[PDB]
Amino acid sequence: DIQLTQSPSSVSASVGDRVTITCRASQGISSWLAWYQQKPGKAPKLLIYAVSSLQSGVPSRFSGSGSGTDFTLTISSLQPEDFATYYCQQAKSFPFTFGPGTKVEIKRTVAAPSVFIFPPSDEQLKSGTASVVCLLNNFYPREAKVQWKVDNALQSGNSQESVTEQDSKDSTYSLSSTLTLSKADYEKHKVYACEVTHQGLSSPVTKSFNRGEC
Amino acid sequence: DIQMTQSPGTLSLSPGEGATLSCRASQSVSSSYLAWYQQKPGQAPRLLIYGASSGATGIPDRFSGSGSGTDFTLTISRLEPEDFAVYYCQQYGSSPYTFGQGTKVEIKRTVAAPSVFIFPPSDEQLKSGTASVVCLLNNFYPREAKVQWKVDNALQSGNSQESVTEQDSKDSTYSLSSTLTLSKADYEKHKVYACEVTHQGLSSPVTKSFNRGE
Amino acid sequence: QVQLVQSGPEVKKPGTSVKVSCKASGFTFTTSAVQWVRQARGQRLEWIGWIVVGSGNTNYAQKFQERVTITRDMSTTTAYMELSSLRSEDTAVYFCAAPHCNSTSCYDAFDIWGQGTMVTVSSASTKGPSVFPLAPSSGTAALGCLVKDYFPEPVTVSWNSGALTSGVHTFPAVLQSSGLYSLSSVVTVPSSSLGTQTYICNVNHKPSNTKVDKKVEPK
Amino acid sequence: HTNLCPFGEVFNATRFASVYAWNRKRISNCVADYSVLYNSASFSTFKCYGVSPTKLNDLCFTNVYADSFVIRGDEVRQIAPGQTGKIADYNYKLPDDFTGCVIAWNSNNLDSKVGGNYNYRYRLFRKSNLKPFERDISTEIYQAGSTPCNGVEGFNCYFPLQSYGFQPTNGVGYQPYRVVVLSFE
Amino acid sequence: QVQLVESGGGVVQPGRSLRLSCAASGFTFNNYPLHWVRQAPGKGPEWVAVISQDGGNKYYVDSVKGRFTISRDNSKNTLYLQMNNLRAEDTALYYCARDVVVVVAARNHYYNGMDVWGQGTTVTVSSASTKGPSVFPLAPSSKSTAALGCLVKDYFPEPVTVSWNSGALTSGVHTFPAVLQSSGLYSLSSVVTVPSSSLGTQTYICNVNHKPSNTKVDKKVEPK
Ligand SMILES: *[C@@H]1O[C@H](CO[C@@H]2O[C@@H](C)[C@@H](O)[C@@H](O)[C@@H]2O)[C@@H](O[C@@H]2O[C@H](CO)[C@@H](O[C@@H]3O[C@H](CO[C@H]4O[C@H](CO)[C@@H](O)[C@H](O)[C@@H]4O)[C@@H](O)[C@H](O[C@H]4O[C@H](CO)[C@@H](O)[C@H](O)[C@@H]4O)[C@@H]3O)[C@H](O)[C@H]2NC(C)=O)[C@H](O)[C@H]1NC(C)=O
Ligand SMILES: *[C@@H]1O[C@H](CO[C@@H]2O[C@@H](C)[C@@H](O)[C@@H](O)[C@@H]2O)[C@@H](O[C@@H]2O[C@H](CO)[C@@H](O)[C@H](O)[C@H]2NC(C)=O)[C@H](O)[C@H]1NC(C)=O
Ligand SMILES: [Cl-]
User: Fold this and answer.
1) Helix (H, G, I), strand (E, B) or coil at A189
2) Which residue of chain D has the CA closest to E57?
3) Glycosylated at which positions (chain D)?
4) Domain locations in chain D?
5) B115-211: which CATH topology?
């Protein structure tokens, strides 16, 4: 198998910027490389094949270069329809392998998340399971860390996260993290908090609640 | 695709007369990529003229070619008996290299009425459970002829097939064979079997019949 | 001896493939090109496509892009035409044609042609014909033979083993709805000779190894 | 004069040239060890002309030219003096008095691609034969008949360069081979 | 128009089989090799298989070798992928794609990428039984712009649709992508942010629609 790496993992750009993405192959593949574009909920779109051949209809602001193990995709002046994930594919031998992808993201001012914590509802407690939800609302950049603490005891391995796509109005992200305990464990403790660390926060922000507190 | 059409469908001339064949292209084609072929029944095409006006090797000088653009002409100065065949033109410059629908040059002759014979199904064939009545139209000109089968005055349709020979090389006539096909059961249900022959050489349709058995 | 020799007759069931060969001789195959043309019985010449020998580049007609691929093998100086998903409508004779060339130059047309290749596509099986006599009726009379229910084409018919040729008509066969062929051959002879001259039609069908000599007697 | 010859950047070059556009590297004022090349099972062909291949180390010439290109295996035999064929006549001609060596090795793992490689080409047609060491990279339409083409391809009007279409599943006689021709003047 | 349309996806227990089909139109079907590419949730595309023009050649990724078989019907312009002995890691969206043919000097060269892609068809390999979700309120806090939502927990399979006030409330809504739990059921949260004043003077109803189980739940979210 031919391995493919892409750099960087993500790009924060603005309309008019010159974006360059690189693709590295574990062995030489001559000119046998293609570039694909993918937007959420859509199949990949072929932009470049044979390193530097523009697919019919693709704007000429897209260009490709390279040979052997190193290849480059350059967007001269970025347009709003260009914010997507770009993949490189080698075609020397089967299996056809893809790169990890590079997400081209919208740059914007740093925005700190609005943090809210939700205790498990009484309707769910009667079902024997408790779910605590921590909402990180409208923040930028995307990188964020959530830590659950149950009576100041740091949790691990009992939470799951989910991030929305970059919003089409303010270019921010939102995150929802859910801590899951049984009804027995949840009623054994009192203070439940999620601690949020983010670039827009000078220090970790904590939102908590006391079990039962109205 | 460039359409090639030819005229006439059948050219009826006497030996010695001059023949003139036509080839039309749906759009202007280069004169250096038009050819003329001659084909005799049961044979392969034979190149006569290429480059519109260049005779092929071994072709007599009585064959000539002319034309330009959309219209081309094949001229035989003095028609020899070996020249009565089908002639095709092909453009082979613009792919696909399309052909015309052919022009058959036949020997013109005086109207000749057919000699009509009817053949009852043999006893050996009736042993097999099928009956075939054959009507022979012998040595007539022109080719156009009509055969109608009548079984106890009932005009038949959809149970007969015809076959015509090529123009004879000695008397320039054609011959036709029509076969009426019935099962042994249906054939034994009737008495009078007749085939009516209509032709230009007959002042009125000629009927040949036979009584089953007798 | 600039020649183009094609494959023998082909009889394939519907839905299979046929691959016709076309071998060159006399000229230098490497610098020419081979086109393929089919012709249904009684119809016009139908251009299928062509191939350039040296490069292998092909052009096909719209009608045949889906089921025809043209190839060539320069080592065996032969060009091929493969036709897949055969059906009854594919029943025709196929020709190959090429300009003769030396090592650098070519003729300005398709002057070399193959003999032709008959391709028959149907569900019928090999079967000899039943030959029935067409007896003369009671100055010249007509008689003949009925070459009925055979497959595939063709059959040959002679009279008195070739002694009788004048006035003989052997008609082209028709394809019955049963998938079999039927053929009639006739001859007109003077009415006086009917009682003092034996007439025997010689029907031969090579695909089934059938040799029938049937005597026609006045009924 | 006491330095090594840059044979490494010649034999082990990342990418080779098409045979019709064969590349030449001028080599002078250097000392090489030709015994390790003759001894190499990596090289499928090691044929010398006018000089013994087993005694190459004991010679001296003013200049050394290193011509390199890619052909397929069945054509390596044409890279020799007095040979005829597509490559010898239309791509790369050696003289009868050629003084040097011809080295080639199988390059399937580098120059073959599944589905067929399109980068390597060869000249298929030419009006006359190439003189020894002549280089023809024109792309004029070949007029095979008597009627002049007008820059448009067609019947008897063919593009002169054709792609090898190297595939890894090809027979070895059709797999790509990288050639190096050493001449000593 | 050049077009490929997939069909045949669905939910399948581990070890059982599925057959996918690809309907092509707008191009000479038999002139092109065709690929199968899949994409698991949240991951990049993965090439699965390819078949040549005439079907004589087939190539497979090692993950499916011996379990999947690719085939085509040139008379029907249809490509297939027979998926047998399905594992959990087969769960993905399956595209069919046309091969990129490179022409140099009128000679075709194949296997250079995938230019025409279909919309994809989803297969989901799991032994989970179809279950509609529970909808629990995420009530806004008393004094903590406020935030509220609905927890759409324990449903199989994907997807659900969540609307607010029957689609009348769209501003400030965040319906997050679902997580797959260790139990095999999906969990999702849909939240809205509103000014704190509008908590006691505006009603917020979430409508969760889950077709596979034929369920539609409405939940009034209200302060405690
Ligand atoms: C053109 O390149 C040839 C290939 O070299 C490769 O490309 C370059 C750019 C580098 O990336 C290099 O790392 C690549 O290998 C080149 O031929 C190469 O020459 C070197 C010597 O300079 C050879 O290294 C020696 O290899 C043998 C065997 O090791 C491997 O081979 C076997 C199978 O053949 C495997 O099974 C083994 O596990 C190894 O993987 C060693 O025995 C040898 O011994 C060294 O160590 C001992 C002490 O133990 C010392 O006594 C010796 O002196 C050595 O120091 C070396 O390691 C290499 O095998 C060889 N490769 C090939 C394919 O021929 C060639 O010279 C270049 N030509 C020009 C003109 O530049
Ligand atoms: C190769 O053939 C060319 C052309 O010959 C003509 O075309 C052939 C296909 C065939 O039909 C021949 O009978 C034709 O004459 C030769 O070049 C021609 O040479 C004549 C003089 O003999 C000259 O008048 C023409 O202009 C030339 N035409 C061209 C296109 O060059 C050529 O000599 C032949 N070479 C060999 C080695 O046989
Ligand atoms: Cl045609």
Assistant:
1) coil
2) D115
3) 12
4) 1-115+168-185, 116-167
5) Immunoglobulin-like (2.60.40)
